[PDB]
Write a protein that binds this DNA or RNA. Sequence first.
DNA 1: ACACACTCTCCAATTCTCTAA
DNA 2: TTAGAGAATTGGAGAGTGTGTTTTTTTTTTTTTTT
Lengths: 92, 665, 233, 11
Amino acid sequence: KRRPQVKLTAEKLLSDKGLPYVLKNAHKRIRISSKKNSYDNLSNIIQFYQLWAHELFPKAKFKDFMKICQTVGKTDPVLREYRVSLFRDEMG
Amino acid sequence: ADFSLTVLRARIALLATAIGGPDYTSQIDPPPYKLGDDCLACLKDLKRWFKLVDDQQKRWDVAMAVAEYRILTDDLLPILIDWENKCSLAAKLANKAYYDKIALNCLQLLVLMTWPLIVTEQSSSNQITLYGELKKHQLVYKKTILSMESGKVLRAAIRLALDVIKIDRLSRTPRDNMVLKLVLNFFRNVIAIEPGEFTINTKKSMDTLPPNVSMDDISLNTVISSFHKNKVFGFLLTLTSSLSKEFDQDFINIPLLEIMFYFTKDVNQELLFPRTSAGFELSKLLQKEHQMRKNVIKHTSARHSRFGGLLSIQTPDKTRLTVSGSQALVDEKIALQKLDDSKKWNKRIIKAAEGLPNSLLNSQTGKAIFFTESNGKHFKEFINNFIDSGFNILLHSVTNYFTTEQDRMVTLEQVEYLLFFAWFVKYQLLRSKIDNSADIKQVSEALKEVTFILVSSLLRSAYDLKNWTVTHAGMIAFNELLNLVSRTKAATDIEFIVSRLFSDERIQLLSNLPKIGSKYSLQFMKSCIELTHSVLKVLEQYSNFQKVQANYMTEPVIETYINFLERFRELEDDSIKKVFSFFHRVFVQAKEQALLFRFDLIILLREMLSPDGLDRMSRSRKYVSQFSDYFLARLKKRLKKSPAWFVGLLFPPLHNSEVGFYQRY
Amino acid sequence: ELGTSNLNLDARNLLAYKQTEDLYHQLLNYPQEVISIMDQTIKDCMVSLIVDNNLDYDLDEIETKFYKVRPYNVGSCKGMRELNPNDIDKLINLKGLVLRSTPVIPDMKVAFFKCNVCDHTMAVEIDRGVIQEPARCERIDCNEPNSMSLIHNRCSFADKQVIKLQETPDFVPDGQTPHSISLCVYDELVDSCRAGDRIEVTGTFRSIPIRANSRQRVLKSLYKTYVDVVHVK
Amino acid sequence: FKSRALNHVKK
DNA sequence: ACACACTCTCCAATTCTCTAA
DNA sequence: TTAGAGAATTGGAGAGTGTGTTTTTTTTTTTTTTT
Ligand SMILES: [Zn+2]
């Protein structure tokens, strides 16, 4: 056979390298200010998400990363279990 | 066989000379043509070659033969023009029947050869083979017919009509009424022939104007000039306006719909109203060009393309990247963008309409067609007199036909009716917006109950069977009716009509419609948006409302709005005003903030708001920056109150009962 | 106020001011990056003067222009025969006499593409000598392969010239004949110098490979060398 | 046969 | 025999459609 | 309304095939034999 293709998958997201890093650091990473423009602060938010997306899975263009995430995010039950777990933690 | 084929071609060629010829005694250098004999039989047998053979075998070979021997250009036009000019001189003074017989039968061939072309999966392989070439030859026909003596054959065709206008309807035999259908059937073709559409067999993934044809020969501009000099517009105007008085409506009023479609098609109404001028706007446009040049310059290095050094960028966790070029040294935004731009893949992509001639339904209409001044004023005069004279009487007849015949319809007649309605109603609204001499009463037949039912029924039936082109046109017609209603309410029965228009069944349909738009072409989504804006604005001025607005707000509508909004480089200044009006409605008024916290919206506002996209001084930036400020304020508040939304922002919202309620609020 | 674009700079002033004593060394060791940094500093300072002092001059005009530094008087001059492979990509200073100059050569800087079917157009940036041609036509509804094509006379170019410099007799070895070196020069400085002129120059000492044949990517082991001047005196 | 028009051609 | 240009082929990745809980 | 089972369409991996390659002045400085 030819070599099988490599893809983004929920296992990467649920890995310790994955989504927990964002929740462990996002409060410290991003910072808005009224003292800078909308365009300024708006640009700032995307920085962290871009660098994190590269570190996670360098295949593809940033937009493609988001739009790929939509499919697995809506379909996989284990990922959804993790997400309802987050919002239960806030219900705790 | 090939020899049988060429035998028929030769038979035709001999018939192409038995017909007659000019006179070489004449010493008149040249004279006109001169007439043969058996020629009745010649014309009749040619008619048989079309009907009894080519139609029965479904070929178009016979047409190829007559095009080879140039019959139209060479004999038919001078036979007719000589008949016309002879009878004209006789009328100036103020067997002959046989001459008139020849005039009739030449015209009927002109209709046949210039008849427009249709291709399907049931057309013969012969026709499919010959489609592209006969298109070229019909283009030649259009140019020629408009050119001869500055178009004088068109006076022959209407003189034929004038014989049958002449004497009382009470006398007029069925054979007699066919002449009055035939003449109008001619002008439809002459307007309808236009440059070809390229078509190929999809076996492998890898212009059609002939050398004697050019655009100015073929443009709609030309056709206006040609008809005006040759006295057509008076005929269409007189004939349509006295239509109610006992001309048998049945024979005329569909052909006479198709004309009005076939040259309203490809005009934007604003081009007919102005709202050194050309030079002034050209200079202003050059300023815009300079701004684009400035944008390129701001991304251009001072020193040359091989001077460039190398750059390294270190992340958190001490890992490093490499990028080249001299601007990357100073601009991190550019370095970040340039870094991702190298990467190869793009996800491959998905794609609604076929079978009908180019129109608003499947072309970008931000592209005018162009008028001489005399043409501009003559065209404005023709349709203005049409509206003030003919429109109500025409619509009343054609609509009370179609209610009795809806089941039998074909896709084209549906798309004609819905794009004749739309054009004339909009143009009148614009004309009276401009000036007080105009009035809205002229188009007022559209509102009465029967037509409202019929536009509704077309939209209904088209939607259920998933016919998306009729659904698209019906969307355009139903938009205008609503627009006209809000006009008239800004001045009795109209409220009754509203209440019936906004029964619950229809709200289910009109709410449903933007949701499916996400898949389809850029026009479809634009129709959905403009209809939605109108639909909500009427019900705002009804004063029910809270039921209806909550019906609209959900994920699959928002998806369509963003998917449309990100192609803003192609769209108008006005449409973006409409989209942000809706976001103001979702975000501030309804206070359903949770819909828009989704990441591909946040990307969009950077692109569009950057020095990249929307101009620093267009009115759009007022709205956009005033929106984003408020957006990010509310987002700040939400994120600090509940940190889980950092992982929320990537994904759709979560539809579980126990956690989802707190999630959304 | 004179409407001009280039600034001279003798490098000794970097040693006088305490904050730039190390920048002087970094300039000699990394010219391509450091000079670019200096350029984008000067342009920003020029903008800052008119906006801070709130003057009448057109901001768009200043944004449109390119500004360039030209460093000189860098250090001791170096003998043409004594340049060694450990000097590659560092700044150098030479003295000599001009033999000849070739005519101006057009050098491409921006490429211009047009779609053959739908007539969409794109301007593309040239770096490292390679044209970054698009894979498919970028118009959304015309996403087709091999669909774009280059239009030569709507590109943008720049002036290049080559000057032949000869060793001055003061340095030639005993019982030998003088040698020569080739200088590449661009834009402002192009037509400055004539046969028989006597000059001193300043520029990066560069080296590049050369191909074995025009058909294939095969390179030779010996590298060509030349000087890329940024100032002439 | 898989005949197809260049529906997208508008320049 | 050694880089290239071009052709051919198979296989699995992807999206679309139907069914039942 | 979600989701999972089955069918159809497309991409490009990668394997294969054929191909091309080495290789009469006219003007100007210098030595030599000829009248
Ligand atoms: Zn294109």
